[PDB]
Amino acid sequence: GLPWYRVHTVLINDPGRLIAAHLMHTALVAGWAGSMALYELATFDPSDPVLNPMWRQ
Amino acid sequence: QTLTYDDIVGTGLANKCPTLDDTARGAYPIDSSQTYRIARLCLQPTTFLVKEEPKNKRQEAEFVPTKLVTRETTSLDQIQGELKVNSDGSLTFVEEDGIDFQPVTVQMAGGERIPLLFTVKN
Numbered sequence: 001g002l003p004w005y006r007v008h009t010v011l012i013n014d015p016g017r018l019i020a021a022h023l024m025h026t027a028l029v030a031g032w033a034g035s036m037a038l039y040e041l042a043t044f045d046p047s048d049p050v051l052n053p054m055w056r057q
Numbered sequence: 058q059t060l061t062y063d064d065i066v067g068t069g070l071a072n073k074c075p076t077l078d079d080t081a082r083g084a085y086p087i088d089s090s091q092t093y094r095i096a097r098l099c100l101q102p103t104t105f106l107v108k109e110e111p112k113n114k115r116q117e118a119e120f121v122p123t124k125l126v127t128r129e130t131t132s133l134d135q136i137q138g139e140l141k142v143n144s145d146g147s148l149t150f151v152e153e154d155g156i157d158f159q160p161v162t163v164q165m166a167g168g169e170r171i172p173l174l175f176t177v178k179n
């Protein structure tokens with residue numbers, strides 16, 4: 001069979017499933033961005049942009 | 058032209074103090090020999106400001122706006138007391154009784170809730 005480092009080559013001649021895989025990657029990246037923003041909002045302290053701005057946190 | 062409870066109920070007007078027309082720019086004479094009282098004192102708050110708690114003592118803290126979250130339950134009303142004429146012609150209101158307190162919760166930017174007993178007791 002295919003070795004483990006080649007499993008995704010099944011997409012090379014399958015444009016529709018390539019689009020599907022690219023869609024899933026895009027979904028994962030967009031979900032990371034939303035998740036990351038929510039985590040930061042749950043931890044960010046906005047009370048002092050002078051001595052505790054976002055880049056200290 | 059006089060409103061009933063059923064005219065007012067649920068409108069929010071019950072939390073509002075009476076107003077006077079723009080024509081009411083007169084003068085009410087005080088007879089230093091007469092005794093007076095305030096038959097009704099009403100206080101309708103429109104803004105609640107909270108002083109921020111700063112980390113820097115060199116920094117002068119300011120009063121910031123807040124959001125009222127306990128609805129139209131804030132006004133003081135039906136307050137009465139003596140209105141004394143003092144020897145120097147000044148007047149002193151001495152509060153006696155009435156609905157002279159309201160618990161109020163306002164919310165600061167970021168979510169911190171500030172309860173207070175808004176009052177003119179005594």
Ligand code: CLA
Pocket residue numbers: 002007008010011020021022024025028
């Ligand atoms: C963008 C991400 C992505 C996408 C769109 C695909 C898409 C595909 N994979 Mg690939 N794969 C991926 C990442 C991805 N893969 C990763 C990270 C691995 C290593 C684990 C693999 C290993 C792999 C194998 C062995 C095979 C495929 C196969 C395929 C095809 C069929 C679907 C399948 O069987 O997946 C398999 C399902 C997964 C790999 C699920 C991965 C789950 C991750 C690792 C953890 C997620 C758990 C949870 C949500 C998060 C954990 C958080 C933690 C704190 C607990 C399809 C083209 C198959 C194929 O067609 O071969 C010819 C196949 O046999 N993939």
Ligand code: CLA
Pocket residue numbers: 004005006007008009
């Ligand atoms: C746009 C980026 C991109 C895309 C779409 C591909 C796509 C592909 N690669 Mg290439 N490659 C890339 C960048 C990319 N690569 C980079 C940056 C490197 C150096 C790191 C390589 C080095 C490389 C080698 C040496 C090989 C491929 C191979 C392949 C083919 C099979 C992949 C597979 O089945 O893996 C399956 C992978 C797994 C089942 C698990 C891998 C788990 C990794 C090691 C750790 C987990 C990563 C994590 C889940 C995601 C974080 C990613 C993010 C931080 C970027 C497929 C055409 C293979 C090929 O040519 O087949 C003929 C092959 O041998 N790639």
Ligand code: CLA
Pocket residue numbers: 015018019022023026
């Ligand atoms: C004018 C026509 C047209 C348009 C607008 C696009 C636009 C796009 N194509 Mg391309 N493509 C075209 C013609 C077109 N293509 C043709 C004729 C072919 C040969 C078949 C291809 C082959 C092709 C491949 C193989 C791939 C793309 C991909 C992409 C997307 C990459 C960016 C992305 O995913 O952002 C993120 C997405 C958004 C911000 C949301 C977009 C909202 C969508 C467009 C609306 C959905 C409704 C719509 C009717 C669905 C079909 C749209 C379709 C016309 C693209 C982008 C949406 C890639 C892709 O889909 O990655 C996931 C991809 O892998 N295209």
Ligand code: CLA
Pocket residue numbers: 008025028029032
């Ligand atoms: C420019 C931006 C960019 C690019 C070019 C890529 C490219 C890729 N990503 Mg995506 N990713 C991105 C941004 C990007 N990513 C962002 C912002 C997020 C949110 C965090 C993700 C989340 C993400 C997930 C969850 C997955 C991918 C995967 C992939 C690979 C799919 C194709 C493949 O089969 O490779 C084959 C794999 C390789 C060629 C190896 C890549 C090696 C990378 C570059 C470094 C890994 C180093 C080290 C081994 C990781 C250890 C991590 C461990 C400590 C947890 C491709 C390399 C998928 C993948 O890797 O499937 C196997 C996958 O599952 N990405």
Ligand SMILES: CC1=C(/C=C/C(C)=C/C=C/C(C)=C/C=C/C=C(C)/C=C/C=C(C)/C=C/C2=C(C)CCCC2(C)C)C(C)(C)CCC1
Pocket residue numbers: 028029030031032035
């Ligand atoms: C379905 C649906 C829905 C939902 C959705 C959701 C809910 C989503 C989510 C999503 C999400 C929530 C996502 C997330 C993602 C994440 C990710 C993707 C991550 C990744 C990571 C990584 C990749 C990492 C790596 C690393 C490590 C781990 C260590 C260090 C180093 C590094 C960085 C490499 C709705 C309702 C809208 C409607 C429609 C349908």
Ligand SMILES: CC1=C(/C=C/C(C)=C/C=C/C(C)=C/C=C/C=C(C)/C=C/C=C(C)/C=C/C2=C(C)CCCC2(C)C)C(C)(C)CCC1
Pocket residue numbers: 032035036037039
């Ligand atoms: C239609 C319909 C349906 C549908 C469904 C669906 C569509 C689902 C989907 C689902 C999904 C799609 C889900 C998701 C999942 C996700 C996950 C599981 C995630 C994870 C993540 C994480 C873990 C993260 C982490 C982090 C980051 C990334 C950054 C920041 C930090 C933290 C740590 C937070 C149902 C069946 C209901 C029913 C019938 C109808």
Ligand SMILES: CCCCCCCCCCCCO[C@@H]1O[C@H](CO)[C@@H](O[C@H]2O[C@H](CO)[C@@H](O)[C@H](O)[C@H]2O)[C@H](O)[C@H]1O
Pocket residue numbers: 038039041042043167168169170
């Ligand atoms: C889209 C669907 C998924 C949505 C779910 C993800 C939501 C993430 C939202 C992040 C913003 C909420 O962030 C949350 O805010 C409040 C107020 O500061 C914090 O709450 C903290 O402070 C308040 C102060 O009143 C305390 O009463 C409370 O006990 C304490 O936990 C949480 O520790 C923080 O995590």
Ligand SMILES: CCCCCCCS[C@@H]1O[C@H](CO)[C@@H](O)[C@H](O)[C@H]1O
Pocket residue numbers: 041042167168169
């Ligand atoms: C996608 C919807 C995410 C849910 C949003 C939660 C309310 S928003 C949230 O409110 C907290 C309390 O006022 C603040 O302390 C915090 O800074 C703010 O991010």
